[PDB]
Structure 1
Amino acid sequence: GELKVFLCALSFVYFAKALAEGYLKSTITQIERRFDIPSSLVGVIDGSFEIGNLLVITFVSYFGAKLHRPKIIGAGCVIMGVGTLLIAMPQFFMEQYKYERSSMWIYVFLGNLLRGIGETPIQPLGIAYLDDFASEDNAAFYIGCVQTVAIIGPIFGFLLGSLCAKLYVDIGFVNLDHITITPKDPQWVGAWWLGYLIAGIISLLAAVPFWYLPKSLPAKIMEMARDFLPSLKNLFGNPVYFLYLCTSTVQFNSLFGMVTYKPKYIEQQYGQSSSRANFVIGLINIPAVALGIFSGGIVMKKFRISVCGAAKLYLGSSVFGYLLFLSLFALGCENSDVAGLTVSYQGTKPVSYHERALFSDCNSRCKCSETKWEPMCGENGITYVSACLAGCQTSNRSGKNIIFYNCTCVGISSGIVGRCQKDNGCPQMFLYFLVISVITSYTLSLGGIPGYILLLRCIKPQLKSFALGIYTLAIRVLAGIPAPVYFGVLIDTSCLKWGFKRCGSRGSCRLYDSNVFRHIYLGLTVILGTVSILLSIAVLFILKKN
């Protein structure tokens, strides 16, 4: 009936917003390159969405509750689509991309800001509506379906990003027969704008069903303004709601931190390429998370689980997920031998901080750059920071490979390009890591829908959307924003070799200490998870008491 139609429309809106998010994440680097803006303005573009979302989420979730919720959702979709289309606008006004053979970025800012605004009503009003009119058993399953869509959607955004990056930026504007560069060329820019047009159109189409959906299923603003403060105290005077908010905030501090640096952990700890890390996370781990969320919804529906049972399932999923995550401490690889950083040039195992001599006797004759990181794998099994630092004098191109010779440090003499592959059982450790991380992701996500149901049922019904708004504001502000920052700071304390930008400032870290990285990355996650587990126990105790 009308409830099923609303569920389908909300699922399509979730898909549209997720696809836009994925495409934006895939193309932000191309946008930075095309517009010739510094990384600070790139972070500003990425953060305009969040400014827009956080500034109006509370107002929308509170006042929109008594209004026509389907129509507010449709208006939000329209604003989302307009903002998405605004990002592609500068393509139609800037000059042709000239490659070696400026103020239009504000639009990219403004459009993203509109996206942040247009997303705000979708979750608080959409879920509350779903919870108001579905039967008690079916609500959890419907919410699970919607959240599964939200989890899976960005993969399509990244696929569209790749497809549009395969096309030239000035396609349709310029004859392509006069262009001598290929996607492999570093000067190539893809059709970044095309995906924004597609996503904006999809978002505008997503708004259409919400103008035919009813407000309810089987002066006032000034009066809501007066009751705003009493309603806030009602939500935060509620102990189950407040403690579940704290529990979720701490658990998401753990989870955002773990997820953000999981690709880098895979690449650094297990010697995998960035592409392989992204493939295993996006194509294996994310489906496991989606399956966990959906199965939590299924379990809530099938066994008619109550609020107390939902709290128990949330606690159990957290407990067993973090216990499984503990086993990752034993799946560790040792540091690869890097001359001067992890080992000395004589092949002696780990020197200390006070012994990091990028220059040695075997490379004193050569004037090599310290800041440059062009690692090569020598025949001796020791990785060197650069071929110059090994005294390599001749280089020959054999097929797709480049081989150095007469490398004095190696002979204490050939070397190929890249880091030496990790040999002693590290691929097996990485396979175990993959299996355990997939299982852990599924197990942790198995409690996602139960906690959501706990939040929705612990409060008086008329506050649902408002509570959902506040929850969303909390997770974003107290977990989503801060956790990547301080996780990054603590992890970067394990850096052995800093990359340097053209201005002399530090760039991305090139070599980490594997043991310190593993300890920090896993321990911070587990400690936050343990705090969350204790808070969840408190939530369960109060639920039993009341």
Structure 2
Amino acid sequence: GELKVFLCALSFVYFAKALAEGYLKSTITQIERRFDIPSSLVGVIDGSFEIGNLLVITFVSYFGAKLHRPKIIGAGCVIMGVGTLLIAMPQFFMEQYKYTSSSMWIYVFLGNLLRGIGETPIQPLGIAYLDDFASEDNAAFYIGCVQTVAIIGPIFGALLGSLCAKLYVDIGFVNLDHITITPKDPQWVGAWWLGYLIAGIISLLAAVPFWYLPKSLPKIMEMARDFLPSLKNLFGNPVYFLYLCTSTVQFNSLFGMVTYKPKYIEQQYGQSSSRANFVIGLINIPAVALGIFSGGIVMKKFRISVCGAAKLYLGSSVFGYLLFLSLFALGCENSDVAGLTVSYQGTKPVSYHERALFSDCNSRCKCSETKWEPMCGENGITYVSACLAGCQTSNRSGKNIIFYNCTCVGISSGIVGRCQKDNGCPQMFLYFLVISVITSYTLSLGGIPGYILLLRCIKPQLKSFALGIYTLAIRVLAGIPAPVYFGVLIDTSCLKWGFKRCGSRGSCRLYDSNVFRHIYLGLTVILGTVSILLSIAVLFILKKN
């Protein structure tokens, strides 16, 4: 009974942590779309959690294995909740919002730092406690349930972020009857702070059950001395080392795939950002959670050994990246954009040295080069801005704006937005959706077999330390670097760069579909192939030993 209570408490803690991270990400994403924060500052906010987690993950993982693990998890939850509550602090000190970096971001930085610090004991100590006292058949199932809760959590965080953004910022502080603005108003400001308070309260509540859980189920100097031999023992173990390398390469592939999958959908298939986020959050993430749970259930039900676990991991990786290779055939060509993909004469592929945002048809109009306000003409050719199309008059009809007397279009009306991709791209998008869902499920099928691989070949006293080292390696070598170079190589395929209000380079507005697809899919597939080779090596060594 105590083991089930611990499992429920750990699942609730995972849910709270995932909800907090999801709310942070979703809130920052919307804030980036309405407000203007320089990318360096949001990068600092992201990196504070990182340094806080990395500085203490190894210390906690090594020195908390022999201590009261449930109580250390409870303390970590309390620290996480306190840090999350500290993020919403500035709202209580800033003046009432009336309708950019000084002495007020310290609260956010400290809150993210403490939230990263409190995060460290949850996974290594919790999973080690779960594995030590559960039977070998049920340990995989319990780990699968915990990871399934972890994957699903951020969906609720995003939902809470949306609900909070639908509320006014000064709710509770200012009489709302005097507010005449609606969420559709460009000056509307959401109650960003409310979700942080809710997440902090949930994290604090999650620490209560661990004060009543026992240390085990049916001094510092010595640990410091044994630390160095233990690290060599873990890295002297070839199964653990090679699985660590395999997971590092595979997560280098996976983080890069996940980070730029929204943008790939929007750019390759012409979908809006909302649709791209929807198909990922409510379709791909459930598939990932189902794959993890299915892997755990398969491990439990058929009593799969370590060799079978390695075989399942290898098969899941192989059949996931094989299906990911199928996405190469599901590609639409670049949309007709005048001056970047085609000339103003409607001539197909134009080269680099001919990027002619100014033409004869729009010489009479003094247009801005930096502004990206795309309009779709009656001739099916998208123009960078209405000025560049030679449009002289604009008429607002209903929710739409129609431009007339567009000189470039006549070589003459146009609507707001990009022209839709006509020749079978929605069908290609549907096939992409199906294959991507199946690929996500297949890749997630091996998440728990690899986790069991990590645990069943080390000496039982070093499970927490091995989990800590694994988490540190995944964060440092896969979590941090993979987005950076994926983005850089992807940015090499940009055709038109937007700018922020301060003149700094913003997100790219137009990519080259072919080059973008090639880079994005090829990097993922190559890293996956390297991971498959390493998994084959792991399986060979397991068979040898």
Q: What TM-score, normalized by structure 1, do the two folds share?
A: 0.98
Deviation of 1:38 (Å): 3.3
Cα distance in 2 between the residues matched to 1:208 and 1:35: 38
Indicate if the aligned counterparts of 1:331 and 1:429 stay in contact, CA closer than 8 A.
yes
Indicate if the aligned counterparts of 1:30 and 1:190 stay in contact, CA closer than 8 A.
no
Deviation of 1:489 (Å): 0.2
Indicate if the aligned counterparts of 1:32 and 1:42 stay in contact, CA closer than 8 A.
no
Larger deviation, residues 499-508 vs 234-243 = 499-508
Which string of whole-angstrom CA distances, capped at 9 and with x for unpartnered residues, describes residues 24-65 of structure 1? Answer: 111125667999853322211121111101110000000000
- Give the total of aligned pairs: 545
Corresponding position of 2:434: 435
Cα distance in 2 between the residues matched to 1:490 and 1:205: 43
Which string of whole-angstrom CA distances, capped at 9 and with x for unpartnered residues, describes residues 144-201 of structure 1? Answer: 0000000000100010001011111111111122222221122211111111111111
Q: Mark the CA change 1:111 to 1:31 in structure 2 (over 3 Å): closer, same or farther.
A: farther
Q: Mark the CA change 1:184 to 1:346 in structure 2 (over 3 Å): closer, same or farther.
A: same
Q: Percent identical across equivalent pairs?
A: 99
Corresponding position of 1:216: 216
Indicate if the aligned counterparts of 1:36 and 1:102 stay in contact, CA closer than 8 A.
no
Query: For 1:419, what is the secondary structure of its paired residue?
Result: coil
Deviation of 1:99 (Å): 2.2
The reply to whether residue 150 of structure 1 matches residue 150 of structure 2 is yes
Indicate if the aligned counterparts of 1:77 and 1:119 stay in contact, CA closer than 8 A.
yes
Which string of whole-angstrom CA distances, capped at 9 and with x for unpartnered residues, describes residues 233-287 of structure 1? Answer: 0000000000000000000000000000000000000000000000000000000
Query: For 1:362, what is the secondary structure of its paired residue?
Result: coil
Larger deviation, residues 92-101 vs 485-494 = 92-101
Deviation of 1:385 (Å): 0.6
Query: For 1:403, what is the secondary structure of its paired residue?
Result: strand
Deviation of 1:299 (Å): 0.5
Cα distance in 2 between the residues matched to 1:131 and 1:100: 48
Deviation of 1:92 (Å): 1.2
Indicate if the aligned counterparts of 1:30 and 1:189 stay in contact, CA closer than 8 A.
no
Deviation of 1:387 (Å): 1.0
Indicate if the aligned counterparts of 1:30 and 1:192 stay in contact, CA closer than 8 A.
no
Ranges in structure 1 where 5+ consecutive residues have no aligned partner: none
Larger deviation, residues 275-284 vs 24-33 = 24-33
Q: Mark the CA change 1:64 to 1:118 in structure 2 (over 3 Å): closer, same or farther.
A: same
Deviation of 1:21 (Å): 0.6
Cα distance in 2 between the residues matched to 1:513 and 1:436: 23
Cα distance in 1 between the residues matched to 2:342 and 2:39: 34
Cα distance in 2 between the residues matched to 1:288 and 1:35: 33
Larger deviation, residues 116-125 vs 42-51 = 42-51
Corresponding position of 2:331: 332
Larger deviation, residues 176-185 vs 281-290 = 176-185
Aligned-residue RMSD, C-alpha = 1.7
Indicate if the aligned counterparts of 1:79 and 1:118 stay in contact, CA closer than 8 A.
yes
Deviation of 1:94 (Å): 1.2
Which string of whole-angstrom CA distances, capped at 9 and with x for unpartnered residues, describes residues 505-530 of structure 1? Answer: 32111100000000000000000000
The ranges of structure 1 where at least 4 consecutive aligned residues each deviate by more than 4 angstroms after the TM superposition are: 29-37
Q: Mark the CA change 1:34 to 1:356 in structure 2 (over 3 Å): closer, same or farther.
A: closer
Cα distance in 2 between the residues matched to 1:441 and 1:497: 31
Which string of whole-angstrom CA distances, capped at 9 and with x for unpartnered residues, describes residues 319-377 of structure 1? Answer: 01000110000000000000110001111101100111001110010000011111101
- Map 1:302-317 to 2 at 5 A: 302-317=301-316
Cα distance in 2 between the residues matched to 1:84 and 1:360: 53
Larger deviation, residues 198-207 vs 503-512 = 503-512
Q: Mark the CA change 1:292 to 1:132 in structure 2 (over 3 Å): closer, same or farther.
A: same
Indicate if the aligned counterparts of 1:35 and 1:102 stay in contact, CA closer than 8 A.
no
Q: Mark the CA change 1:254 to 1:37 in structure 2 (over 3 Å): closer, same or farther.
A: closer
Cα distance in 1 between the residues matched to 2:243 and 2:31: 39
Cα distance in 1 between the residues matched to 2:50 and 2:301: 37
Deviation of 1:226 (Å): 0.5
Indicate if the aligned counterparts of 1:252 and 1:479 stay in contact, CA closer than 8 A.
yes
Indicate if the aligned counterparts of 1:255 and 1:525 stay in contact, CA closer than 8 A.
yes
Q: Mark the CA change 1:494 to 1:22 in structure 2 (over 3 Å): closer, same or farther.
A: same
- Map 1:105-254 to 2 at 5 A: 105-218=105-218, 220-254=219-253
Indicate if the aligned counterparts of 1:143 and 1:297 stay in contact, CA closer than 8 A.
yes
Cα distance in 1 between the residues matched to 2:296 and 2:487: 33
Deviation of 1:125 (Å): 0.2
Deviation of 1:298 (Å): 0.4
Cα distance in 2 between the residues matched to 1:383 and 1:193: 40
Indicate if the aligned counterparts of 1:378 and 1:415 stay in contact, CA closer than 8 A.
yes
Cα distance in 1 between the residues matched to 2:426 and 2:376: 18
Deviation of 1:74 (Å): 0.4
Q: What TM-score, normalized by structure 2, do the two folds share?
A: 0.98
Indicate if the aligned counterparts of 1:374 and 1:386 stay in contact, CA closer than 8 A.
yes
Which string of whole-angstrom CA distances, capped at 9 and with x for unpartnered residues, describes residues 77-103 of structure 1? Answer: 010111111111111111111229942
Cα distance in 1 between the residues matched to 2:33 and 2:430: 36
Larger deviation, residues 495-504 vs 415-424 = 495-504
Larger deviation, residues 184-193 vs 322-331 = 184-193
Q: Mark the CA change 1:67 to 1:106 in structure 2 (over 3 Å): closer, same or farther.
A: same
Which string of whole-angstrom CA distances, capped at 9 and with x for unpartnered residues, describes residues 424-455 of structure 1? Answer: 00000000000000000000100000000000
Which string of whole-angstrom CA distances, capped at 9 and with x for unpartnered residues, describes residues 100-129 of structure 1? Answer: 994222101101111000011000000000
Cα distance in 2 between the residues matched to 1:35 and 1:381: 33
Indicate if the aligned counterparts of 1:31 and 1:192 stay in contact, CA closer than 8 A.
no
Q: Mark the CA change 1:340 to 1:166 in structure 2 (over 3 Å): closer, same or farther.
A: same
Cα distance in 2 between the residues matched to 1:38 and 1:529: 34
Indicate if the aligned counterparts of 1:32 and 1:39 stay in contact, CA closer than 8 A.
no
Corresponding position of 1:104: 104
Corresponding position of 1:41: 41
Deviation of 1:469 (Å): 0.3
Deviation of 1:142 (Å): 0.3
